[PDB]
Amino acid sequence: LQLLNRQQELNIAKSSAIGNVRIIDNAVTDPNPVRPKKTIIIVIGVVLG
Amino acid sequence: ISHILDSISQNYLAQNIARQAAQDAKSLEFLNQQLPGRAVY
């Protein structure tokens, strides 16, 4: 019976299994592209010219 | 803005006191799913 209780506890622990890792924010895309940086490219064009 | 900041603080509080109980909550969930010699019960 002691081994039965230990087996049940191990079943619970195996199934729960919550890890030390947490997904806080799932991935969502920023709708504003990060490339190309249009303003800095045009400014660099002006200054280089 | 004060209503928003109070909401932020309360959401943070609830998130913290839910993460603390998360492991025991999932253990209890699986135990409820696991309830079907009688000493083990």
CSV table of C-alpha atoms in Angstrom, one decimal:
chain,number,residue,atom,x,y,z
A,1,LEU,CA,0.0,0.0,0.0
A,2,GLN,CA,2.9,2.4,0.7
A,3,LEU,CA,4.2,1.7,-2.9
A,4,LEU,CA,0.7,2.2,-4.2
A,5,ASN,CA,0.5,5.6,-2.6
A,6,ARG,CA,4.0,6.5,-3.9
A,7,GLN,CA,3.0,5.4,-7.4
A,8,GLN,CA,-0.2,7.6,-7.3
A,9,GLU,CA,1.9,10.6,-6.1
A,10,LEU,CA,4.4,10.0,-8.9
A,11,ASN,CA,1.5,9.8,-11.4
A,12,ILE,CA,0.2,13.2,-10.2
A,13,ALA,CA,3.7,14.7,-10.3
A,14,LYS,CA,4.4,13.3,-13.8
A,15,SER,CA,1.1,14.5,-15.2
A,16,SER,CA,1.2,18.0,-13.6
A,17,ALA,CA,4.9,18.6,-14.7
A,18,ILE,CA,4.6,22.4,-14.7
A,19,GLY,CA,8.2,23.5,-15.5
A,20,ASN,CA,10.3,26.4,-14.4
A,21,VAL,CA,9.6,27.9,-17.8
A,22,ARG,CA,6.6,30.2,-18.4
A,23,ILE,CA,5.3,31.6,-21.7
A,24,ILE,CA,4.2,35.0,-20.6
A,25,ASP,CA,3.6,36.7,-24.0
A,26,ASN,CA,2.8,34.6,-26.9
A,27,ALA,CA,4.2,35.9,-30.2
A,28,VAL,CA,2.4,38.8,-31.9
A,29,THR,CA,3.9,40.6,-34.9
A,30,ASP,CA,4.4,44.4,-34.8
A,31,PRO,CA,2.5,45.6,-37.8
A,32,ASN,CA,5.1,48.3,-38.6
A,33,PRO,CA,8.1,46.8,-40.3
A,34,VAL,CA,11.5,47.1,-38.6
A,35,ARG,CA,13.2,47.2,-42.0
A,36,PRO,CA,13.7,49.2,-44.1
A,37,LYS,CA,14.0,52.2,-41.8
A,38,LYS,CA,12.7,54.6,-44.4
A,39,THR,CA,13.4,57.9,-42.7
A,40,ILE,CA,17.0,57.1,-41.8
A,41,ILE,CA,17.7,55.8,-45.3
A,42,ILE,CA,16.3,58.9,-46.9
A,43,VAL,CA,18.2,61.1,-44.5
A,44,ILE,CA,21.4,59.2,-45.2
A,45,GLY,CA,20.8,59.6,-48.9
A,46,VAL,CA,20.4,63.4,-48.4
A,47,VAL,CA,23.6,63.7,-46.3
A,48,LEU,CA,25.6,61.4,-48.5
A,49,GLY,CA,24.6,63.3,-51.6
B,1,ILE,CA,-5.0,57.2,-15.9
B,2,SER,CA,-5.5,56.5,-12.2
B,3,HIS,CA,-8.2,53.9,-13.1
B,4,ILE,CA,-5.8,52.4,-15.6
B,5,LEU,CA,-3.0,52.2,-13.1
B,6,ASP,CA,-5.2,50.6,-10.5
B,7,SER,CA,-6.4,48.1,-13.1
B,8,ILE,CA,-2.7,47.3,-13.9
B,9,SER,CA,-1.8,46.8,-10.3
B,10,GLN,CA,-4.8,44.6,-9.6
B,11,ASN,CA,-4.1,42.5,-12.7
B,12,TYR,CA,-0.5,42.1,-11.6
B,13,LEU,CA,-1.6,41.1,-8.1
B,14,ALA,CA,-4.0,38.5,-9.5
B,15,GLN,CA,-1.4,37.2,-11.9
B,16,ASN,CA,1.1,36.8,-9.1
B,17,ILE,CA,-1.3,35.0,-6.8
B,18,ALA,CA,-2.4,32.7,-9.6
B,19,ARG,CA,1.2,31.8,-10.7
B,20,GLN,CA,1.9,30.9,-7.0
B,21,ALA,CA,-1.0,28.5,-7.0
B,22,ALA,CA,-0.5,27.3,-10.6
B,23,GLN,CA,1.4,24.1,-9.7
B,24,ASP,CA,-1.1,23.0,-7.0
B,25,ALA,CA,-4.0,24.0,-9.3
B,26,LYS,CA,-2.8,21.7,-12.1
B,27,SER,CA,-2.1,18.9,-9.6
B,28,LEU,CA,-5.6,19.3,-8.3
B,29,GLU,CA,-7.0,19.3,-11.8
B,30,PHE,CA,-5.3,16.0,-12.7
B,31,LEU,CA,-6.3,14.5,-9.4
B,32,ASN,CA,-9.9,15.3,-10.2
B,33,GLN,CA,-9.4,13.7,-13.6
B,34,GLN,CA,-7.8,10.7,-11.8
B,35,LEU,CA,-10.4,9.8,-9.2
B,36,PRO,CA,-11.7,6.3,-10.1
B,37,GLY,CA,-7.6,-0.7,-2.6
B,38,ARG,CA,-9.9,1.8,-1.0
B,39,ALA,CA,-7.0,3.1,1.3
B,40,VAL,CA,-5.4,4.5,-1.9
B,41,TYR,CA,-8.8,6.2,-2.6
